[PDB]
Amino acid sequence: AEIPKEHLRAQTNVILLNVLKQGDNYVYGIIKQVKEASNGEMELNEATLYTIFKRLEKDGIISSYWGDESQGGRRKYYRLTEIGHENXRLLEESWSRVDKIIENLEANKKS
Amino acid sequence: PKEHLRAQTNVILLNVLKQGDNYVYGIIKQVKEASNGEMELNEATLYTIFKRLEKDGIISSYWGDESQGGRRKYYRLTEIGHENXRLLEESWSRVDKIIENLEANKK
């Protein structure tokens, strides 16, 4: 009927960590880049991001800082911590094993 | 993260039932065999998860043949379940596409 929240949550978390793995980033840019990378199909919800980033920041996975004010407004940047980088590696390793397990489930059914 | 563990377990379980109807120990056995012994799912945990999935219409259950003595509860992926699996594939495929384009556009 619908995508379970645990998958939605995991998908958004995977997207965000890949974005911040590429570089420090801010909410407007993250939303725009993901929108562009999804050919318009994924417009992340701004309130949700502010929500996730405060959690991720309390768990030490990201840190934040203000950009320069030369142009009037300032961006709030987010940075992947060394903890966050280890977390990205753990996700990559574990999903990779899960994909192989599923591949092996099909192969073992061929029997 | 728990949501990833949770999602990972969920997709494994749905894939097992996509391969065929199965019972809790048979699923555990198959996952252990498919992971070279590395993933040994907890029998009480699955039992819990399957009761949730069943109340939510994603799987249904029925009793197996008792010719070898005891009673085994089998589970089947419902039509809702097959559609949920199709939605997971679609949405994760988009995530994979997004990530590939994020690197490609960076260059």
Automatic annotation (TrEMBL), chain B:
<feature type="binding site">
    <location>
        <position position="96"/>
    </location>
    <ligand>
        <name>Cu(2+) 2</name>
    </ligand>
</feature>
<dbReference type="GO" id="GO:0046872">
    <property type="term" value="F:metal ion binding"/>
</dbReference>
<dbReference type="InterPro" id="IPR036388">
    <property type="entry name" value="WH-like_DNA-bd_sf"/>
</dbReference>
<feature type="domain" description="Transcription regulator PadR N-terminal">
    <location>
        <begin position="13"/>
        <end position="86"/>
    </location>
</feature>
<dbReference type="InterPro" id="IPR036390">
    <property type="entry name" value="WH_DNA-bd_sf"/>
</dbReference>
<dbReference type="InterPro" id="IPR052509">
    <property type="entry name" value="Metal_resp_DNA-bind_regulator"/>
</dbReference>
<dbReference type="Pfam" id="PF03551">
    <property type="entry name" value="PadR"/>
</dbReference>
<feature type="binding site">
    <location>
        <position position="11"/>
    </location>
    <ligand>
        <name>Cu(2+) 2</name>
    </ligand>
</feature>
<keyword id="KW-0479">Metal-binding</keyword>
<dbReference type="InterPro" id="IPR005149">
    <property type="entry name" value="Tscrpt_reg_PadR_N"/>
</dbReference>
<feature type="binding site">
    <location>
        <position position="11"/>
    </location>
    <ligand>
        <name>Cu(2+) 1</name>
    </ligand>
</feature>
<protein>
    <submittedName>
        <fullName>Transcriptional regulator, PadR-like family</fullName>
    </submittedName>
</protein>
